[PDB]
Amino acid sequence: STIEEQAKTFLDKFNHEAEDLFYQSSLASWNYNTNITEENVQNMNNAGDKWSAFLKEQSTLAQMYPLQEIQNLTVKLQLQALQQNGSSVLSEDKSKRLNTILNTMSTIYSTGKVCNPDNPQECLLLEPGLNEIMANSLDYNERLWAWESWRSEVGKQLRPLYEEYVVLKNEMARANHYEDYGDYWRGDYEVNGVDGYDYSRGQLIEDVEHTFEEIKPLYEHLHAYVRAKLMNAYPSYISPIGCLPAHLLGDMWGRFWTNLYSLTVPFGQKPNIDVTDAMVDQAWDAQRIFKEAEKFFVSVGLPNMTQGFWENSMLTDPGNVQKAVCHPTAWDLGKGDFRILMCTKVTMDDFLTAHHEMGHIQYDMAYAAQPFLLRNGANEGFHEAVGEIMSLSAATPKHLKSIGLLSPDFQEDNETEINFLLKQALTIVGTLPFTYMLEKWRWMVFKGEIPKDQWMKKWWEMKREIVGVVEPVPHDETYCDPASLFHVSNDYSFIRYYTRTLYQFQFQEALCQAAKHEGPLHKCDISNSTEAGQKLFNMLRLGKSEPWTLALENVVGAKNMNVRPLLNYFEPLFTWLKDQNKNSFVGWSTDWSPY
Amino acid sequence: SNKLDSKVSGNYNYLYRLFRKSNLKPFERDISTEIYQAGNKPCNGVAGFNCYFPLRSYSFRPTYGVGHQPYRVVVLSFELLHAPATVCGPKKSTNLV
Ligand SMILES: *[C@@H]1O[C@H](CO)[C@@H](O)[C@H](O)[C@H]1NC(C)=O
Ligand SMILES: *[C@@H]1O[C@H](CO)[C@@H](O)[C@H](O)[C@H]1NC(C)=O
Ligand SMILES: *[C@@H]1O[C@H](CO)[C@@H](O)[C@H](O)[C@H]1NC(C)=O
Ligand SMILES: *[C@@H]1O[C@H](CO)[C@@H](O)[C@H](O)[C@H]1NC(C)=O
Ligand SMILES: *[C@@H]1O[C@H](CO)[C@@H](O)[C@H](O)[C@H]1NC(C)=O
Ligand SMILES: *[C@@H]1O[C@H](CO)[C@@H](O)[C@H](O)[C@H]1NC(C)=O
Q1: Do A480 and A158 touch, CB atoms closer than 8 A?
Q2: In terms of CB atoms within 10 Å, which end of chain B has fewer, N or C?
């Protein structure tokens, strides 16, 4: 009779209707992705338009239900998320201009091709060739030219776009009773109405600062170690006291440092743990690889996947006649249907990618009982984090020996682990200063504290203190270098990569101690421990129904950000880094002495 | 009944009653199509705000999970009254000796 029962009935109508409409759009997207055809594109467009229109009308209906008198945690969560205006809070022209701005900068970056001058006959696009020109080349000038040319062309054609992008996104948030567009992204971690577990939108920056203050001491030795390693490759271009050149990061923005594993290898003679040759020798096809993962997922306690996955998921490239998306994507179509789009090859990475992607789908069946709108993770970081521990556990030598990939007589000495430890540190610890820095620049520019003519120099100054990477040359306001990133050029939150890093390591220790492991973190194999999976399933089964602070404390016991697990796993590397950094200079200086 | 009650485009011929003002009595059929009254405002025959059609059509397809595939259910109800029991089981016949 009251408003609340009306919302409950209204939500009941929405939940059943949305699932079928979501499935049709998801099925259209699945067909479009695995079969790129003209009819498939318009099918996704028509389904996507109907799905967008359905969300529009549902949001308008729910806005008539006040949030103040909603008494249980479940109902208010769905109505708060469903009442989100998005870009509709402003006028049509303002919304369309932002959407057009969103559309055009996506096209500019996707079609952004920078090539060598003086030969316009053919040019090299960003994806196929520009990726290899910085990840395998050893030429300082070639990397420098590619670094400067791409940001020069893209920055100039994105600077007017980024001027309106930051303002328009701020308009949408401020019209939605938000301080800025940065607070809009910070609202994912907001917890309100729950005692003890309450979390504030603005509390994220200081909490991330609290965990970051301990990341730098480990990163500083890593920074000194790579700089000493980079001295062999570049003797004079990089000063021992200065920062690293921006175009010698192995990638475009320095997010992943895995491209310097060969350059910064601690023991090049010592073999790695890779057993890729075992799969081809024993004829382990991708069909059986997923069986091995499925055999692994049932060992830890997760139930085996349904038979519908086999007849609906394509794990091999269709061929030349059919065009399918090779990007690793997990598909939760709804209504009990789960698929994974896989162009799997016979490689170690694809085996780890599969384990990473089944972790996404295995998370999906966990919250299947929850309503469709709540059929999501508690925060953005949980979904990827739970799949990362699956790859971490599957990458252990004990797991490889258990399933026969690695020989039981293999010697797991400390020499073959530090290089394995270093490679993970390059991928994980390397992105931590960069992820916080650009995002911290991103919230701050959303806040407006940064002067409109003081973005890059402030950005460059942060790179001197946070990541310790020096710029090739100073850049003025004509170029827009930050917008060159794939995520920012598509309105994608980047702090989620930072949170999933801590979540992955937080989950591991709680998972490992529940498995009763007497060894270090890098030797933790969660296999054959069904009790650990049940405790893991406790957070999995909650999904978005419970706050992330409550969900975190269910497993690890801490509702807030925790940096302690990260130091434990790299402790053998952290002490080892101190051994070889006695001659090198720990830390870095803001001076531009190198270049 | 996936092979029979499912179509690739969707078998919408099967409907279920999503809303009703009260729970059904045992062995009771409700085929009413009156718009459900979810709010205090009268429906007036219009499926608008807080007013929706009580019956929803199942979109059965052969590409669903085990729990969502159509299942034909035949329910047998047995009663004994003062009237003679005229429904018997088969009786076995043994060869004559
Ligand atoms: C992919 O699309 C083409 C063109 O419509 C069609 O001929 C083909 O049968 C499709 N393949 C599959 C597996 O649906
Ligand atoms: C609160 O109401 C919602 C309405 O659907 C219900 O799902 C939930 O279980 C209720 N919680 C409690 C503790 O009764
Ligand atoms: C969404 O927009 C409508 C009208 O533009 C407004 O009344 C409503 O308060 C907005 N939603 C929120 C959460 O502020
Ligand atoms: C999953 O495991 C259950 C119990 O062992 C079994 O009944 C079922 O057939 C299995 N399904 C698949 C697809 O392996
Ligand atoms: C491995 O341990 C042995 C024994 O303590 C030691 O001599 C050697 O230096 C260690 N090597 C590395 C790479 O830690
Ligand atoms: C875990 O169980 C599987 C299957 O029962 C077995 O092959 C594997 O050896 C077990 N792990 C260990 C460490 O014994």
Answers
A1: yes
A2: C
